[PDB]
Amino acid sequence: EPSLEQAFKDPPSSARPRVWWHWMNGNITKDGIRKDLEWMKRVGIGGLQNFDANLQTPQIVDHRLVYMTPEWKDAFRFAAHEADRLDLELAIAASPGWSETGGPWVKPQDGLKKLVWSETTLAGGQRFVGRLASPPGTTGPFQTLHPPVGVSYAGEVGVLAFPVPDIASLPVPRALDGAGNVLAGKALVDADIAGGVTLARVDGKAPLLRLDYQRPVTVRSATVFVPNVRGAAFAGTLESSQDGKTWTPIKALELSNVPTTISFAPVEAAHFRLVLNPPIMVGQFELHSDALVDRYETKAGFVMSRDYYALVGPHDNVTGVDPDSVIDLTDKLKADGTLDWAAPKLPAGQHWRVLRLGYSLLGTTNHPAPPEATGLEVDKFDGEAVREYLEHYIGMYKDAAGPDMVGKRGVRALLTDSIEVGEANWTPRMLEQFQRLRGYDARPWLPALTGTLVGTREQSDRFLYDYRRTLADLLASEHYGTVADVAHENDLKVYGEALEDHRPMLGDDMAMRSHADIPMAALWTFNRDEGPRQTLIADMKGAASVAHLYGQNLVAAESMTASMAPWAFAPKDLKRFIDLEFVTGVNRPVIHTSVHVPVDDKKPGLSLAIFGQYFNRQESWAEMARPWVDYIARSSLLLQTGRNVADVAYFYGEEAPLTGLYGDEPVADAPVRYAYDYINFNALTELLANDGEDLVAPSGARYKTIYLGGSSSHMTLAALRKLAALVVGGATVVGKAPIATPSNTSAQEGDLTEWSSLVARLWPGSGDARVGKGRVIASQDIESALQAMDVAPDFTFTGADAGVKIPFVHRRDGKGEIYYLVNQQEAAQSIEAHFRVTGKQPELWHPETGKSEPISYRISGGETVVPLHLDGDEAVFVVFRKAAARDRVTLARQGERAVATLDGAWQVAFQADRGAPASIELARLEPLDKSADPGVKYFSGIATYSRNFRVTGKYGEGRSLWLDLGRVGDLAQVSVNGVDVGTAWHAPYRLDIGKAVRKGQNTLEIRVANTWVNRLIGDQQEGAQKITWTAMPTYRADAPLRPSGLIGPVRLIEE
């Protein structure tokens, strides 16, 4: 019912931001829960997401509430009833602690699994005698490795046999450390890859391991493991001494928590050195006569690579085991361990290799929960196991809160925090899943997962790609799809984060969020010098793209996490962060964090370890945060309205996720004057359809073109088929022809030729070809291609310096357009802004106030030009909804005129119990932090400034009167003749008072709030009577104070 103008004045609950609400280490009371949630209502917060966080925190309650005990459950039930009563959306995390999906009700068999194996050799012309050695059952990341500085499970996978050539066995070398110490060489091939030799350090560092032989040996591959390389700083190089003193490097070895295998063109030498460029024990160092899968450990998913296409193999033209030769002996293994097999005869020089595949546990656990609530992360690739995990977990909260308080009331939502559970690469249905998703049998290729080259290096590399891709597919469907299904079956919504930070595991961070009701990302605070963490830009852009393409519309972000900056933020410091989230596509900030306040006496009290935000009822400016939250709620409202408008669908390939591709370097490829969404393989192949020359999704997302970016130079036949079909159906593609498929699917299904035909059709050579009813522009210049399609820029601007960024969001409704602009610079800008819109008279909408303002404009030639002044870091909405009566309006120029400076004496009254005197008189406005009085100097809280002032004008009726406060530390709420005229919380600190003043004498009261910083510093001073309590120390007595109070000058200004 309400108009957009009314909603903008008083945003609805759906527009109001949420907070994270950590319960710190049992420091919980019902009394505090109510005061927390009543504070959130006062301040306009729309919801909260609870965590029971088992991080070591001093006990400030009479007794800690232990997770899921009766008193804890009654506290949570109370929280749920208070959120219901107060109309706050309550969410919980998907596991005890905060991530991911794990707990002690996960049976050992259902934990995360890694592939393990034993190997045996046979003659052929012999019945295998005895027992196949059991694969390792150790919990840990690989084979026999343990987790770093007791629950276990060993499963079966299968038994494979395949012929292999008799190979030149290698002598045991002399192991010389860098110094010349003689090491136990045999321990380098030991059954214990974690236990080998300790290296001595030589001057100039360069620890090395020389392997000197008595004859030349031909080496093709090497495996190395250095225990505890845990940032994880160490490289390694393999060199060969032909003479013992001249070295030619063979290849480098990236080291990690799992072994590293490299393969190369053969080398004949009697001396091999492992050099460890930056107790150093080398657990394994093994040279191989044969060619192994180069870097198989990472390709098999035991450890991540940033870019799997970058793992360029040696060009040695070798071919390994013939896949057709591989035999499945799974049948023949008996529980006894014996194998009943008649090994068929082989050519001479060729023996049998029998591979016994099994699985064992990673052992990773949910965090941070108490031991009783800590247990295995559920197998993320097994939908049934995930469902059992989550149905049980939800059952616990229905018991705790009561079933009436889970679903439509009380607990409304589930949060899947960003995932980091280690590197799992097996799940029991894997062979069926691989067959169904990739279209061919993985069984003949499994030996590649253990290092054994199958077919050509390229075929094994493509199989491993296909294997990694199946794991990524199952993560999205079997974990995140199941989580959303179970939540929905229980009337819950899902807030869903993904990778967030570079590439912690396999998976696509759009697909991982495509099933969630609210795709979610994160943004940390950052110094303006340094800029944001790039991975978090990609994280948010991915999440926004999901919501646009799959129709969720809502885009959440874990907002404004801060590290080692105790209580050092007022809204003036935060605006640029939330504006960056807004302009990237976030429209539901979830503030990190609002720690639960269990007792009132300790101020500012508990914090989530070393992290901020510190946004709870103990914050110094907490009772004046409503205008800040209103700013976020008003911005979110407009940024949820209608649909996102974007012209470019940026296809980023089938390899690394967005936080991987752009974890360090931002996308350099994207348009500037046009908006864009990322599209992944699923979006490309399932959502996009032709609409004339456009590509549309069921959500209403609508694009002029697909851009081939990211890793799309490697493209699968399945993707290419869909792309060709959309082109032929009328769509435009901008990009250069892919150079290869990364997958074996098309070769295995016999579709060799078709990939090349489709490339030849879409990229015939001209570089700009009509293809069916569509068009392929063979360019990597997106804006020049859009120009050649006659697509005008959506937003652009003149009149600013070079390098000035004013990024934008474009929203669209049946009622008109909304552009969101952010001047990402401290310097004010005066621009002419060009919008691709017509027929509408623009207005500026200000989220600070909820008011709209008319603006001059000219409509002409398919665009509207608007002259804009933007303060430093100003964010503003340019709204095109009113039908334009005229095509040009030039508003009368408005001048500014200082009318008076409110200099002279002020009364100041200080919030009680804050170490300050009740009141002072200032002959002159002065920064309180420069005061001679320590109780004023170090004051944190609300100082109330008081004064009268004379007005000799009539205002409102065509002439306005502004109060400019000058410098303010840090925000100020202003009352004129008892009337609240607003609160100024960022520069320029200016408020419209024309309506509240009267002729003659007027009363003025200005409530200035600052941060806790100064009172914290004040408490470190020698002799200090301590006002504050925090868990750990925050500032040294050295620390520079923040400017505090009403600094001014305070001026009356007429238009």
Ligand code: NA
């Ligand atoms: Na996160």
